[PDB]
Amino acid sequence: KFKLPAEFITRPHPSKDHGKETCTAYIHPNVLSSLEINPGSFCTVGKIGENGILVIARAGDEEVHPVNVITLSTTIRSVGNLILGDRLELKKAQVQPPYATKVTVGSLQGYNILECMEEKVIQKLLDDSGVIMPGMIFQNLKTKAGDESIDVVITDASDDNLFYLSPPFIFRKGSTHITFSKETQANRKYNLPEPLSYAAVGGLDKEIESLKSAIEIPLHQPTLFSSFGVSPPRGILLHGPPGTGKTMLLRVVANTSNAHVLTINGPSIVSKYLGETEAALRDIFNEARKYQPSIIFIDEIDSIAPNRANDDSGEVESRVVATLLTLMDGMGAAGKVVVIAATNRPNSVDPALRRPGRFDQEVEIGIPDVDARFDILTKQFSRMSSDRHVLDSEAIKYIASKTHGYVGADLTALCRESVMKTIQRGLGTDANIDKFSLKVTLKDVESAMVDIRPSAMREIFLEMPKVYWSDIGGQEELKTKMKEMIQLPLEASETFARLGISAPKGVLLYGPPGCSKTLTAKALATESGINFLAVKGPEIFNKYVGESERAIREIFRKARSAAPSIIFFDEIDALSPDRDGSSTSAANHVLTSLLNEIDGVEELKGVVIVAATNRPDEIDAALLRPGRLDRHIYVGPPDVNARLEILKKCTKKFNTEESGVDLHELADRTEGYSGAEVVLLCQEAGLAAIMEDLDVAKVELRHFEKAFKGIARGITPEMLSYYEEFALRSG
């Protein structure tokens, strides 16, 4: 007896360009009879788990149509965005849908098509459908000029939501009316699926040309290679950091390429039985070979094809990998099939798959630079197109300049969070405002940047206060030198490119305790704008043989990803013995890893290294060399003006202006004090004032005299002589 398949396969009409066919689904007559859908009746088609389209049945030749295949024209397939090879559920329609009065003929190329085309044939093209919905495209209609063609869209119909993806309407001729428009898309309140296109991808121009070259010729022009006697390619392996655009490229290729599309979403095929995973792969490839041209997509190919020499890769993994190898390049030819796989871990995919004939090209989807990012942001904010007020192309360029380390998913999140800041702003002025009526200004993108960190930085939990350059008294030379490294390379980038010189990548801050070293680290973490990473000295060390070096390599990797970036090595001398004979093997290997990762066989492009030390002569010469820690900056005890600034900042909420204390006399009194000692003087004075009474009014000179009597000077001439004789080398 005939068995009814549970899932049908979309395929294209071979017959014709246009006609009355534009809503007819040819099906195997066994299936039509078994479902009592006799030819001419109304039947519905839809992707599994989703509402359905409405079409007209017809019987197909028994000797050609397999049981699975349903044949549909581009017109209908556009409605639900059915890609060839999608799995359909077919059903009979219980009720005939009603008639609409309005037919909203849109345009895709946006012309006044009534002028470019004879509407007397457009009427026939619109009439022939019989059924009408929002979404149906009509394609490649030749203009009056003849040399050019136009495409048309039915944007909406209505009469003057469950079980149906698109509201079905029947073309009752005469009561239907045209409402022409240049619009290219259906009413978004219907929520039809929106086709993907290459114009939505930004920053991957060369990669997009590579994929198009490696898909079009192998599929739609195989005679070209045969003329030259070279075999066509069979694979592309997109790879790169997570979030860079790989699956988006696969979706765009599936939507745009006119080929049969089969998918393997990770271990979607892995099955409990002995030979079902291999059977699934063989079925997929035989289907691809039966319906040429075809594309087989494999996301997370590192999950259904591991290295096969890895310890965890047993026989199941070996058999699956062997099946892939033999199906791509084996004794039987695979035909016009291109396998496009995406993977975040290219070196976990078996080496045998990564060679010509299996995966010819490997296309890297890398982290976007400034211009790729401007492209991404332009394209998304164009996908907005009226609700913005972010315009003139300068605001988006400013955002691209400010959002360092972003990967492309973070940019979409930034647009979304800016929209949400707009919504909550609107609520902030009117608790019932029309959220559909707001606009997302640059203030909103800036306000969303503060809640979106780059996906690269998610692992780096650093809970820091907010320290400004205004908090650091004195240190003007240090501030200028740090600006020259942190902000000038990014503001004056074109000038550096012109002069051909890149800025130095390292500073070693060295000085006595309590003078601004780590405070500058916090200031950079607040004011720099560029991403901040920090390692707290011997934090990295581990009892195991190879882990302390892996910590260095991993922090530098995370900095490379988030470049431009700052890495703060606090008390670096813990990592850098002098290699004078010490037997501390782990420290020496940490030092060597740090050396070879700051300046080694692979260059370090956008990272700036800051290191602070109390004992700078204990650091290795190779580390202090130009190119690793370029310039050495001395941060010494504050002078009179720096002390005075510290006191004015710390004593602000003391009502010092009343009477008693005088900050200039104090600043002169505290000679030799580290900044921390000045801060302690203020703290202990406020504490003594609280002891004399729980007032909130004012401190008095008695309190400062008492506090001064207690604080001893921790910095001695020996320390300053040490640091000055280190500084004497620079000259």
Ligand X SMILES: Nc1ncnc2c1ncn2[C@@H]1O[C@H](COP(=O)(O)OP(=O)(O)OP(O)(O)=S)[C@@H](O)[C@H]1O
Only segment of 53-61, 89-97, 168-176, 243-251 that touches a copy of itself (CB under 8 A): 243-251
Task: Looking at residues 675 to 704 of the shown chain, list those that interact with a copy of itself (rule: CB under 8 A).
Answer: 680, 682-684, 686-687, 689-691, 694-696
d(CA 246, CA 343): 8
420 binds, among a copy of itself, ligand X, none (CB under 5 to 8 A by kind): a copy of itself
Site pattern 446..485 for a copy of itself (x: CB under 8 A):
------x--x--xx-xxxxx------------------x-
Only segment of 55-63, 107-115, 497-505, 657-665 that touches a copy of itself (CB under 8 A): 497-505
515 binds, among ligand X, a copy of itself, none (CB under 5 to 8 A by kind): ligand X
Which among 277, 365, 361 has a CA at the least distance from the CA of 314? 277
d(CA 499, CA 609): 23
Q: Which residues contact 437 (CB under 8 A, 6 or more apart)?
A: 426
Among residues 87, 212, 453, 625, the one that binds ligand X under rule CB under 6 A: 625
Q: Rule CB under 6 A: is residue 576 a binding residue for ligand X?
A: no
Which among 68, 67, 70 has a CA at the least distance from the CA of 26? 70
Among residues 256, 344, 361, 447, the one that binds ligand X under rule CB under 6 A: 344
CB 166 within 8 A of CB 120: no
For residue 699, the SS3 value is: coil
Task: Looking at residues 440 to 479 of the shown chain, list those that interact with ligand X (rule: CB under 6 A).
Answer: 471-475
For residue 623, give Cα distances in angstroms to 430, 549, 629.
59, 16, 6
Q: In the bound complex, what is the minimum distance in angstroms from residue 701's beta carbon to a copy of itself?
A: 16
Which among 309, 303, 304 has a CA at the least distance from the CA of 321? 304
Which burial class, exposed, middle or buried, applies to 696 when counting CB atoms under 10 A from its CB (0-12, 13-18, 19+)? exposed
Task: Looking at residues 520 to 539 of the shown chain, list those that interact with a copy of itself (rule: CB under 8 A).
Answer: 521-522, 525, 534, 536-539
Task: Looking at residues 186 to 215 of the shown chain, list those that interact with ligand X (rule: CB under 6 A).
Answer: 201-203
Q: Rule CB under 6 A: is residue 513 a binding residue for ligand X?
A: yes
CB 217 within 8 A of CB 211: no
Task: Looking at residues 34 to 63 of the shown chain, list those that interact with ligand X (rule: CB under 6 A).
Answer: none
Q: Rule CB under 6 A: is residue 572 a binding residue for ligand X?
A: no
Q: In the bound complex, what is the minimum distance in angstroms from residue 109's beta carbon to a copy of itself?
A: 22
Q: In the bound complex, what is the minimum distance in angstroms from residue 686's beta carbon to ligand X?
A: 14
For 78: left if phi > 0, alpha if psi spans -120 to 50, otherwise beta; the answer is alpha
Q: Rule CB under 8 A: is residue 63 a binding residue for a copy of itself?
A: no
Q: Beta 42-47 vs 53-59: how paired, if at all?
A: antiparallel
Among residues 106, 245, 306, 616, the one that binds ligand X under rule CB under 6 A: 245
Q: Rule CB under 6 A: is residue 370 a binding residue for ligand X?
A: no
List own/partner pairs for 553-556 with CB under 8 A and 24 or more apart.
553/593, 553/597, 556/597, 556/598, 556/604, 556/607
Task: Looking at residues 416 to 445 of the shown chain, list those that interact with a copy of itself (rule: CB under 8 A).
Answer: 416, 419-420, 423, 435-436, 440
Site pattern 656..695 for ligand X (x: CB under 6 A):
-------------------xx--x----------------
646 binds, among a copy of itself, ligand X, none (CB under 5 to 8 A by kind): ligand X
Site pattern 631..650 for ligand X (x: CB under 6 A):
-------x-------x----
DSSP H or E segment with residue 364: strand 361-364
416 binds, among ligand X, a copy of itself, none (CB under 5 to 8 A by kind): a copy of itself
403 binds, among ligand X, a copy of itself, none (CB under 5 to 8 A by kind): none
517 binds, among a copy of itself, ligand X, none (CB under 5 to 8 A by kind): ligand X
Which burial class, exposed, middle or buried, applies to 129 when counting CB atoms under 10 A from its CB (0-12, 13-18, 19+)? buried
DSSP H or E segment with residue 410: helix 409-429
- In the block, residue with structure tokens 């934090």: 539
Q: Which residues does the annotation place in the binding site?
A: 240-247, 511-518
DSSP 8-state secondary structure symbol assigned to residue 85: T
84 Cα distance to chain centroid? 29
d(CA 590, CA 540): 9
Among residues 21, 207, 410, 677, the one that binds a copy of itself under rule CB under 8 A: 410
Q: What burial letters (b/e) apply to 447-459, b meaning 16+ CB within 10 Å?
A: bbbeebbbbbbee
Only segment of 150-158, 244-252, 390-398, 422-430 that touches ligand X (CB under 6 A): 244-252
614 binds, among ligand X, a copy of itself, none (CB under 5 to 8 A by kind): ligand X
Q: Which residues does the annotation place in the binding site for ATP?
A: 240-247, 511-518
Between 246-256 and 205-220, two packed helices, what is the crossing angle to 10 degrees? Answer: 40
Which among 157, 200, 154 has a CA at the least distance from the CA of 175? 157
Identify which of residues 30 and 561 has a Cβ nearer to a copy of itself in the complex.
561
Tell me which residues touch ligand X (CB under 6 A). Answer: 201-203, 242-248, 299-300, 325, 329-330, 342, 344, 352, 357, 376, 379, 408-409, 412, 471-475, 513-519, 599, 612, 614, 622, 625, 627, 638, 646, 675-676, 679
